[PDB]
Enzyme design. Structure first.
Site, PDB file in Angstrom:
ATOM      1  CB  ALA A   1      84.768  78.490  -8.298  1.00  0.00           C
TER       2      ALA A   1
ATOM      3  CB  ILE B   1      86.378  75.588  -1.500  1.00  0.00           C
ATOM      4  CG1 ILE B   1      86.149  76.869  -0.697  1.00  0.00           C
ATOM      5  CG2 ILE B   1      86.643  74.414  -0.570  1.00  0.00           C
ATOM      6  CD1 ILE B   1      85.018  76.773   0.301  1.00  0.00           C
TER       7      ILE B   1
ATOM      8  CG  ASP C   1     115.974  53.815  24.300  1.00  0.00           C
ATOM      9  OD1 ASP C   1     116.302  55.009  24.471  1.00  0.00           O
ATOM     10  OD2 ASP C   1     114.852  53.366  24.614  1.00  0.00           O
TER      11      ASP C   1
ATOM     12  NE  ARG D   1     120.228  52.226  39.961  1.00  0.00           N
ATOM     13  CZ  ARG D   1     120.602  52.870  38.861  1.00  0.00           C
ATOM     14  NH1 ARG D   1     120.848  52.198  37.745  1.00  0.00           N
ATOM     15  NH2 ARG D   1     120.732  54.190  38.879  1.00  0.00           N
TER      16      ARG D   1
ATOM     17  CG  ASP E   1     111.454  49.868  27.010  1.00  0.00           C
ATOM     18  OD1 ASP E   1     111.170  50.759  27.839  1.00  0.00           O
ATOM     19  OD2 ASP E   1     112.524  49.224  27.048  1.00  0.00           O
TER      20      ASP E   1
ATOM     21  CG  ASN F   1     109.490  54.019  34.200  1.00  0.00           C
ATOM     22  OD1 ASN F   1     108.357  53.795  34.625  1.00  0.00           O
ATOM     23  ND2 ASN F   1     110.586  53.746  34.899  1.00  0.00           N
ATOM     24  CG  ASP F   2     110.842  54.955  28.333  1.00  0.00           C
ATOM     25  OD1 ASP F   2     111.473  55.451  29.290  1.00  0.00           O
ATOM     26  OD2 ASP F   2     111.104  53.831  27.855  1.00  0.00           O
TER      27      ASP F   2
ATOM     28  CG  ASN G   1      86.704  71.302  -7.614  1.00  0.00           C
ATOM     29  OD1 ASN G   1      85.833  72.145  -7.825  1.00  0.00           O
ATOM     30  ND2 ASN G   1      87.986  71.512  -7.890  1.00  0.00           N
TER      31      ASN G   1
HETATM   32  C1  LIG Z   1      96.865  67.256   6.507  1.00  0.00           C
HETATM   33  C2  LIG Z   1      96.671  65.888   7.092  1.00  0.00           C
HETATM   34  C3  LIG Z   1      95.517  65.586   7.698  1.00  0.00           C
HETATM   35  C4  LIG Z   1      95.040  64.178   7.931  1.00  0.00           C
HETATM   36  C5  LIG Z   1      93.664  63.652   7.544  1.00  0.00           C
HETATM   37  C6  LIG Z   1      93.559  62.167   7.838  1.00  0.00           C
HETATM   38  C7  LIG Z   1      92.567  64.314   7.110  1.00  0.00           C
HETATM   39  C8  LIG Z   1      92.305  65.787   6.892  1.00  0.00           C
HETATM   40  C9  LIG Z   1      92.922  66.324   5.579  1.00  0.00           C
HETATM   41  C10 LIG Z   1      92.866  67.830   5.464  1.00  0.00           C
HETATM   42  C11 LIG Z   1      92.461  68.494   4.370  1.00  0.00           C
HETATM   43  C12 LIG Z   1      92.522  69.971   4.270  1.00  0.00           C
HETATM   44  C13 LIG Z   1      92.169  70.661   3.179  1.00  0.00           C
HETATM   45  C14 LIG Z   1      92.230  72.171   3.095  1.00  0.00           C
HETATM   46  C15 LIG Z   1      90.987  72.773   2.392  1.00  0.00           C
HETATM   47  C16 LIG Z   1      91.125  74.304   2.224  1.00  0.00           C
HETATM   48  C17 LIG Z   1      89.766  72.470   3.229  1.00  0.00           C
HETATM   49  C18 LIG Z   1      88.602  71.885   2.895  1.00  0.00           C
HETATM   50  C19 LIG Z   1      88.251  71.325   1.524  1.00  0.00           C
HETATM   51  C20 LIG Z   1      87.486  71.765   3.944  1.00  0.00           C
HETATM   52  O1  LIG Z   1      86.194  71.840   3.317  1.00  0.00           O
HETATM   53  C21 LIG Z   1      85.796  73.174   3.022  1.00  0.00           C
HETATM   54  C22 LIG Z   1      87.456  70.351   4.536  1.00  0.00           C
HETATM   55  C23 LIG Z   1      88.338  70.035   5.694  1.00  0.00           C
HETATM   56  C24 LIG Z   1      88.303  68.760   6.095  1.00  0.00           C
HETATM   57  C25 LIG Z   1      89.102  68.270   7.260  1.00  0.00           C
HETATM   58  O2  LIG Z   1      88.756  69.092   8.403  1.00  0.00           O
HETATM   59  C26 LIG Z   1      88.860  66.751   7.478  1.00  0.00           C
HETATM   60  C27 LIG Z   1      90.184  66.140   7.792  1.00  0.00           C
HETATM   61  O3  LIG Z   1      90.480  65.688   8.883  1.00  0.00           O
HETATM   62  O4  LIG Z   1      90.907  66.002   6.677  1.00  0.00           O
END
Ligand SMILES: C/C=C/C/C(C)=C\[C@H]1C/C=C/C=C/C[C@H](C)/C=C(\C)[C@@H](OC)C/C=C/[C@@H](O)CC(=O)O1
Ligand code: NA
Length: 994
Positions: free
Chosen positions: A305, A307, A351, A489, A703, A706-707, A796
């Site tokens: 609930a 999460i 640049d 140079r 580019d 070196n960068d 959700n």
């Molecule tokens: C924030 C930007 C991230 C980039 C991407 C591509 C993916 C991330 C997105 C993150 C989500 C976070 C959510 C916070 C809540 C609180 C957490 C959960 C629901 C967790 O489930 C309990 C799951 C977490 C998943 C990530 O680790 C996967 C990921 O890379 O997503």
């Protein structure tokens, strides 16, 4: 050997103890190989594996949900009921998410290529060497090569290791050091040593770097460094050392997961504290097994609930759609999170050439000597039309067209520009326009000769392609191009020895035509040209020349001046040591001043306004260029980085100045400066380190390789579309059109995503907040379970997921580029925003619990039960006199949970409309503004009906169908959420916005 460039060929052989004839002995091969190692970059070990999946299950919150999966599974098997197919759904759907969510986090295969592995593409497979065990040359694996090996290289061959050139067998040796210089001009190498021990790589005229390929020629050399000790290797170790930090948003989502973990663990204990009255209960009344079932089923239901398990899938889809949107505006973003953090861009180091300018070099102005007489001195300024490499233009003096052929000084002007020139024009058939060949600067000189036409050759009779190099070819007919002195140079100039053809054109023997840095070449002029005659270089004239040079470079014109001089009586072909590069200095002395040409590298068409966008958006812009400080500052004034009339003495630095300053003052300089000229190779990364010390999200560009070190170290690695793969693999974003405007265009889009993204974040958590309130109220009062975890997950994921993802298509803000960059230490929710989604969330808890309690107490078709006995439903068959109505299944009925669930879905669709804007009323912006949101809501409610009607579903979620009699009550309890939010938003704009 690291400083092999500053050592003679005899010394390098003496150190390793090698024979230039036979080379190393197989005994030395084993000894050197065991001491130095194989010539190859270390393969990236310690990679990701099944362990990468473990990293996703490291956080505290993910362990909580994981534990809810185990606890759910334990309560599944141990049960009386015989629910067959609808029993292991609770543990199943949990794993579905824990698997899916973990797959999203482990996703680093398709959205981020390794840069060091791409860097390994520059090391060749095999190389030619001379071992003492055989006579003829023998090639082996490049990794088998060791320091001391007498290697051989020819045209087309890619250099295996950092080689100290011993002897050039061909006429001249050319190498394409594009990967280590950027400038795609095949530089010429030599045998003689370079005196400076800490000399830069470009100054190393006697070295062949690994990864580099020979453009023309053939030579033999001795290997100095190999593998990680090479210039490529030193760049590799820098990238392998730099650790990429997580975007500020990611740190907040991790920080949020920690806070939400404390919230769950707190309430789980709080629920246990409320049932402290069970401590004062009899043993002969109920059981511990019946109690633990309620406690365990509450904790698991409470975990799902709180999460927002749908969040990650929602943002990943949003950023995925954000990537296609950015690519359309010429911005190839690599990593997904980079699209969000791009809006947080605080600083942009760019640049000049290519990005800020069009690189369409063209000579604008040019002056020669008119006449000199004592104190009096008169010049002859001109202007050229045609900002392009095309010959279509004309010359004019003082806004009046003229014939350059009638000016003797201009005749030799075009003569030097034609002869002392390695570039040339070329008409294109496919595109249908003139193109360049060689350097941008020298091509403009070729174009200038075509525009002038000092010999009045046929023009209209010539064709398009034929006249591409007309006037220049005519010039080449007079003098023979004996040999050119390479551009160094140290003296900054280029000359060419020329002998007259069999034509007799008043040619006083052989001549040398020099061009280069004005302030330098003019000093080496003892004479001055006045048409055909000659005069001694006096002070007053030297002042008039350099004054005009300064006026063009410092003025609003921002011209790249180029002094043209000629040597009247140069030394004979024999006296000149053709190999000694240092002797080219005295070979270009005793010159005669001919004239000067001022060319411009015109800025981009959009940078004029794009820079102003950064000024309003609070983003700082730092130009990095190769031009002199005086002109670099003038260029900054012209584009917009500097004002037309303001102080920039301590806001602009050179590479020479920045080094002389102490470590503290360098950091003090980076916080205010915004214009670096003559930048060293290591300065880009140094500057970024100082920017990062101020917690400023920087965006460095590059580019070449070196960068690469600077790009990867920066928050937003900016690479060019025309840049090398190493730069594009190390960069976070790749400019498709190579423009500073598209840099800001992406930054503007990144901010818009930040707003819409953060909007559905507070929307989803607001949903989860109310879900916890529903569980805490239904548990504290001891009511029949209002909601089930199997339901909440689908709510959700799908019910809240569809509309939340649709919130990504929300309209942007017209005043988004007016506010400064979002602070890295800025929270998602705070103060008022906390209370707002706390009250909006807290209401749904009473709405769901109240909707369920409505059916139990004061309902139409529901059994009229009182509040005091409804809270003691667990004593069904025990207290028979009080409980006299229907079966005990009445308290475990599907209707009340359907009421609580239906209300949750109704208010969420309404809350989604409330999340169309942060404070803007629905009266101002209608709910039909975002079309995708309506479609998602229609689909969301459509799915809500489907899980109730289609029999295979409602039995799973423990829900039954609702008629109008029950649905009318749902709207009455749900819709008030809009009025509440309308009141809250009204308070924000009135009694808060100030
Ligand atoms: C924030 C930007 C991230 C980039 C991407 C591509 C993916 C991330 C997105 C993150 C989500 C976070 C959510 C916070 C809540 C609180 C957490 C959960 C629901 C967790 O489930 C309990 C799951 C977490 C998943 C990530 O680790 C996967 C990921 O890379 O997503
Ligand atoms: Na980076």
């Amino acid at each position: 050997m690291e400083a092999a460039h500053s050592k003679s060929t005899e010394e390098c052989l003496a150190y390793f103890g090698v024979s230039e004839t036979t080379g190393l002995t197989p005994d030395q091969v084993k000894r050197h190989l065991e001491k130095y190692g194989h010539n190859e970059l270390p393969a990236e070990e310690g990679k990701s594996l099944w362990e990468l999946v473990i990293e996703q299950f490291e956080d505290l919150l993910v362990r909580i949900l994981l534990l809810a999966a185990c606890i759910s599974f334990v309560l599944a098997w141990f049960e009386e009921g015989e629910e067959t197919i609808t029993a292991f759904v609770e543990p199943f759907v949990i794993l579905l998410i824990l698997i899916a969510n973990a797959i999203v986090g482990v996703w680093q295969e398709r959205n981020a290529e390794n840069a060091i592995e791409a860097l390994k593409e520059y090391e060749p497979e095999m190389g030619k060497v001379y071992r003492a065990d055989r006579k003829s040359v023998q090639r082996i694996k490049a990794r088998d090569i060791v320091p001391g090996d007498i290697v051989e290289v020819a045209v087309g061959d890619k250099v295996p290791a950092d080689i100290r050139i011993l002897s050039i067998k061909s006429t001249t040796l050319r190498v394409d050091q594009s990967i280590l210089t950027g400038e795609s001009v095949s530089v010429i190498k030599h045998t003689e040593p370079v005196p400076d021990p800490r000399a830069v790589n470009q100054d190393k005229k006697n070295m062949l770097f690994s990864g580099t390929n020979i453009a023309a020629g053939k030579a033999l050399g001795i290997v100095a460094t190999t593998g990680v000790s090479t210039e490529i290797g030193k760049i590799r170790d820098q990238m392998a050392a730099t650790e990429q930090d997580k975007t500020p948003l990611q740190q907040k989502l991790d920080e949020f997961g920690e806070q939400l973990s404390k919230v769950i663990s707190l309430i789980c204990v709080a629920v246990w504290l409320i049932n402290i009255g069970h401590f004062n209960d009899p043993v002969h009344g109920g059981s511990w097994i019946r109690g633990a079932i309620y406690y365990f089923k509450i904790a698991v239901a409470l975990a799902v609930a709180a999460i927002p398990e749908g969040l990650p899938a929602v943002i990943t889809t949003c950023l995925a759609l954000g990537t296609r949107r950015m690519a359309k505006k010429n911005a190839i973003v690599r990593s997904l999170p980079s699209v969000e953090t791009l809006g947080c861009t605080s600083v942009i180091c760019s640049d000049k050439t290519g990005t800020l300018t069009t690189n369409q070099m063209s000579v604008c102005k040019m002056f020669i000597i008119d006449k000199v007489d004592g104190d009096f001195c008169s010049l002859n300024e001109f202007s050229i039309t045609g900002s392009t490499y095309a010959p279509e233009g004309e010359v004019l003096k003082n806004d009046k067209p003229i014939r350059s052929g009638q000016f003797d000084g201009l005749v030799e002007l075009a003569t030097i520009c034609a002869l002392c020139n390695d570039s040339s024009l070329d008409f294109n058939e496919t595109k249908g326009v003139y193109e360049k060949v060689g350097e941008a600067t020298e091509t403009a000189l070729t174009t200038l000769v075509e525009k002038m036409n000092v010999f009045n050759t046929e023009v209209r009779n010539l064709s398009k392609v034929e006249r591409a190099n007309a006037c220049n070819s005519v010039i080449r007919q007079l003098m023979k191009k004996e040999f050119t002195l390479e551009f160094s140079r140290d003296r900054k100039s280029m000359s060419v020895y020329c002998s007259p053809a069999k034509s007799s054109r008043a040619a006083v023997g052989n001549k040398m035509f020099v061009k280069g840095a004005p302030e330098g070449v003019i000093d080496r002029c003892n004479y001055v040209r006045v048409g055909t005659t000659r005069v001694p270089m006096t002070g007053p004239v030297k002042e008039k020349i350099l004054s005009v040079i300064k006026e063009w470079g410092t003025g609003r014109d921002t011209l790249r001046c180029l002094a043209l001089a000629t040597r009247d009586t140069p030394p004979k072909r024999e006296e000149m040591v053709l190999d000694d590069s240092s002797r080219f200095m005295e070979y270009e002395t005793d010159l005669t001043f001919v004239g000067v040409v001022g060319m411009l590298d015109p800025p981009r068409k959009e940078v004029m306004g794009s820079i102003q966008l950064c000024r309003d958006a609070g983003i700082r812009v730092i130009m990095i260029t190769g031009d002199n400080k005086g002109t670099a500052i003038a260029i900054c004034r012209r584009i917009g980085i500097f004002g037309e009339n303001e102080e920039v003495a301590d806001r602009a630095y050179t590479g020479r100045e920045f080094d002389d300053l102490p470590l503290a003052e360098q950091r003090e300089a980076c916080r205010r400066a915004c214009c670096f000229a003559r930048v060293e190779p290591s300065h880009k990364s140094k500057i970024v380190e100082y920017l990062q010390s101020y917690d400023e999200i920087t965006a460095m560009t590059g580019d070449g390789v070196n960068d690469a070190p600077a790009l990867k170290k920066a928050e937003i690695g900016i690479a060019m579309g025309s840049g090398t793969a190493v730069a594009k693999t190390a960069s976070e974003m790749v400019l498709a059109d190579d423009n500073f405007s598209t840099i800001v265009a992406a930054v503007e889009e990144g901010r818009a995503i930040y707003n819409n993204m953060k909007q559905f974040i507070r929307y989803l958590i607001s949903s989860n907040v109310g879900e916890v309130v529903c569980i805490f109220l239904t548990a504290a009062l001891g009511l029949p379970e209002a909601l089930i975890p199997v339901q909440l997950l689908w709510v959700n994921l799908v019910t809240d997921g569809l509309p939340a993802t649709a919130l990504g298509f929300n309209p942007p803000d017209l005043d988004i580029m007016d506010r400064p960059p979002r602070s890295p230490k800025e929270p998602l929710i705070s103060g008022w925003l906390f209370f707002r989604y706390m009250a909006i969330g807290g209401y749904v808890g009473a709405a769901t619990v109240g909707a369920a309690a409505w059916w139990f107490m004061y309902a139409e078709d529901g059994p009229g039960v009182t509040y005091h006995q409804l809270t003691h439903f667990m004593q069904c068959t025990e207290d028979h006199p009080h409980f006299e109505g229907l079966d005990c299944e009445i308290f475990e009925a599907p209707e009340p949970m359907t009421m609580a669930l239906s209300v949750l879905v109704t208010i969420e669709m309404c809350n989604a409309l409330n999340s169309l804007s942060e404070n803007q009323s629905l009266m101002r912006m209608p709910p039909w503004v975002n079309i995708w949101l309506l479609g998602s809501i229609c689909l969301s409610m459509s799915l809500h009906f489907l899980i109730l009607y289609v029999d295979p579903l409602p039995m799973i979620f423990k829900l039954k169908a609702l008629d109008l009699t029950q649905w009318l009550m749902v709207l009455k309890i749900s819709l008030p959420v809009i009025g509440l939010d309308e009141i809250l938003k009204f308070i924000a704009r009135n009694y808060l916005e100030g």
